[PDB]
Amino acid sequence: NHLISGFENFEKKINYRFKNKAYLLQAFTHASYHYNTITDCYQRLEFLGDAILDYLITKHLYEDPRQHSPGVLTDLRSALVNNTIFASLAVKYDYHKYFKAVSPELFHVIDDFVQFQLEKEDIEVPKAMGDIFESLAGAIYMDSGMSLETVWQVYYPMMRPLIEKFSANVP
Amino acid sequence: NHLISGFENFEKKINYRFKNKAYLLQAFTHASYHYNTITDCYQRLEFLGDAILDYLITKHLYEDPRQHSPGVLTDLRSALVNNTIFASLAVKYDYHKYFKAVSPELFHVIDDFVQFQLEKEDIEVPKAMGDIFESLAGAIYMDSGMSLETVWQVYYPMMRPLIEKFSAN
Ligand SMILES: [Mg+2]
Ligand SMILES: [Mg+2]
Ligand SMILES: [Mg+2]
Numbered sequence: 001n002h003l004i005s006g007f008e009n010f011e012k013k014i015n016y017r018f019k020n021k022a023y024l025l026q027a028f029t030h031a032s033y034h035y036n037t038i039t040d041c042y043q044r045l046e047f048l049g050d051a052i053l054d055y056l057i058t059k060h061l062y063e064d065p066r067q068h069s070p071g072v073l074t075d076l077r078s079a080l081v082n083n084t085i086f087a088s089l090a091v092k093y094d095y096h097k098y099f100k101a102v103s104p105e106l107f108h109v110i111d112d113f114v115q116f117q118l119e120k121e122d123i124e125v126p127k128a129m130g131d132i133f134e135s136l137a138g139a140i141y142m143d144s145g146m147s148l149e150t151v152w153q154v155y156y157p158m159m160r161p162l163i164e165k166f167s168a169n170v171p
Numbered sequence: 172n173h174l175i176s177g178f179e180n181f182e183k184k185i186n187y188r189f190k191n192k193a194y195l196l197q198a199f200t201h202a203s204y205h206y207n208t209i210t211d212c213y214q215r216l217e218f219l220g221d222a223i224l225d226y227l228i229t230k231h232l233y234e235d236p237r238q239h240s241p242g243v244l245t246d247l248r249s250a251l252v253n254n255t256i257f258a259s260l261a262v263k264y265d266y267h268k269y270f271k272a273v274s275p276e277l278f279h280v281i282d283d284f285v286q287f288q289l290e291k292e293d294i295e296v297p298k299a300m301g302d303i304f305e306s307l308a309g310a311i312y313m314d315s316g317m318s319l320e321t322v323w324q325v326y327y328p329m330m331r332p333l334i335e336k337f338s339a340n
């Protein structure tokens with residue numbers, strides 16, 4: 001191994017410590033990362049985290065005292081639950097530094113996207129960065145004994161600025 | 172009281188008795204149903220129910236001991252969480268008999284779909300039936316104090332046949 005080396009720094013950035021680091025490793029393992037022979041890649045956990053985040057965001061929007069009407073609920077959800085915004089948040093919280101892959105093509109797309117985001121429509125969005133925003137939510141869920149509340153404790157702080165920005169002026 | 176007349180039979184069909192029948196009424200109230208001026212229409216409950224069902228079905232699929240691959244999980248979820256399957260289940264459980272709306276076109280589309288399902292690509296699927304499969308889940312969630320487990324106690328029995336069938340194919 002060197003597989004889990006360095007993960008403590010990520011845990012500090014999102015403020016969550018894994019009990020079973022295998023979940024965190026799985027979350028960050030791309031299908032091309034053949035050097036990880038101890039867990040699967042992140043796809044199963046992405047499948048799970050995807051629905052988890054959809055539910056948590058939906059619930060938050062539904063409960064917001066601003067009492068959005070249905071068309072607005074729908075627009076807000078569309079704008080907060082999509083691969084592009086999930087990627088932008090992943091790179092904002094350094095997920096790309098712990099991602100594991102073997103892909104010069106991913107490197108290129110991620111690198112351009114990360115640069116472009118820091119200076120902030122035809123920039124290519126790296127879908128994998130959105131996918132690990134989802135997979136990590138799944139990992140946290142699984143690590144905490146299937147606790148939605150733990151996931152939201154971690155994820156709400158990262159999403160709150162866009163939630164507030166969009167809920168004041170809906171795209 | 173005019174508005175909730177006969178809802179006790181629906182409650183028996185799905186095996187859930189509402190603590191506050193307002194949520195049941197709201198779940199079945201289409202935006203066109205101008206006679207109801209005591210609750211909102213179903214759309215806010217549909218918004219919530221939609222994500223609730225996607226979570227519960229995703230979770231079920233992920234936990235299945237066959238350890239479906241990602242590709243399979245994704246295909247099963249698409250086959251199980253779509254407006255058409257939801258509309259077919261709503262109708263199978265008589266949701267259409269309690270739907271409140273003012274729209275001949277909608278009821279015509281529902282009638283034809285209900286018939287087509289009894290006779291069982293061409294047929295028009297009434298989106299509103301899928302929408303109220305979602306809204307009722309949202310309603311049960313609210314009525315039960317935002318309990319995901321109560322929703323699934325009601326909804327799993329309705330979905331199990333299709334979950335088991337698609338999961339074997
Ligand atoms: Mg989703
Ligand atoms: Mg994804
Ligand atoms: Mg949905």
Ligand SMILES: [Mg+2]
Nearest residue numbers: 217301302305
């Ligand atoms: Mg719907």
